Amino acid sequence: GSHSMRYFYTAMSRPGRGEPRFIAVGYVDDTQFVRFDSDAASPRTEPRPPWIEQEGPEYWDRNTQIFKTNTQTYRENLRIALRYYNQSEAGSHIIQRMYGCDLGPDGRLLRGHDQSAYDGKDYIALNEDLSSWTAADTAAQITQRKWEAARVAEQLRAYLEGLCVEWLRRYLENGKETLQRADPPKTHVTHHPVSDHEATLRCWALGFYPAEITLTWQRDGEDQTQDTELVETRPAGDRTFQKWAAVVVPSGEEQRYTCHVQHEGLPKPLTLRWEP
């Protein structure tokens, strides 16, 4: 949907090197706004974008106690997971969680999320109805029956439909100058001969926000999906993103190829050709 709030939790055990590390990060769309790391000398939750700094001392204290409590909880969970999988206390393991809410165009909950993974594999996930669960194996099935018994989905549903939506709306107001501002991509095409009979055409898209973009190469109006090399969208470091799509074409036929760029920061789709 139009906007979303997401918190990412990562807990990692490291036998022989102290207690398990717990990291938590929060995002509103593609913008990180908070961070917490139990390995920081004097662990506190820190601001990562200007608009969250206006929050008072009690917001920071409340955040910190939640993440400190989570550190303890996930340390217990890593120990429990070992028993469920008959694993020894000599290995290093990871539990990841990702939860949050999506706001639709009208400002109400579009859909909620809450998923957990163990060692990079799905473990348990809250269903879209925000009432039931999907467990990936017989181990997660135990967690599931425990969560059904403690009525956990109900707690999550209350959060996702209420607080998550209220706070996301508040952050969007407070950070409107950036959160609700799309930066269109600055586009250009490059030419790189590979031999006498072929040249590489590269369509670039730089400086855009948000990350979502579409770059297509077309030969006489036909989508060259099979011959286009695309790089994964990458961050620039200043909040914006970059991406390029390339195609190897026969020398002299460059003008039969067009690059199509789609991004919400653009009034209407761009069509680029290589101008020599």
């Binding site: 918190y7 938590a24 929060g26 917001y59 409340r62 955040n63 939640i66 993440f67 409590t69 989570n70 909880t73 217990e76 969970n77 429990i80 997971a81 469920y84 539990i95 939860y99 135990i142 967690t143 425990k146 969560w147 403690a150 956990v152 707690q155 999550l156 959060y159 607080l163 998550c164 706070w167």
Partner: peptide, 9 residues
């Protein structure tokens, strides 16, 4: 604001 819910596996 994160959720105030802590449940074990």
């Amino acid at each position: 604001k994160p959720i105030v819910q802590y449940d074990n596996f």
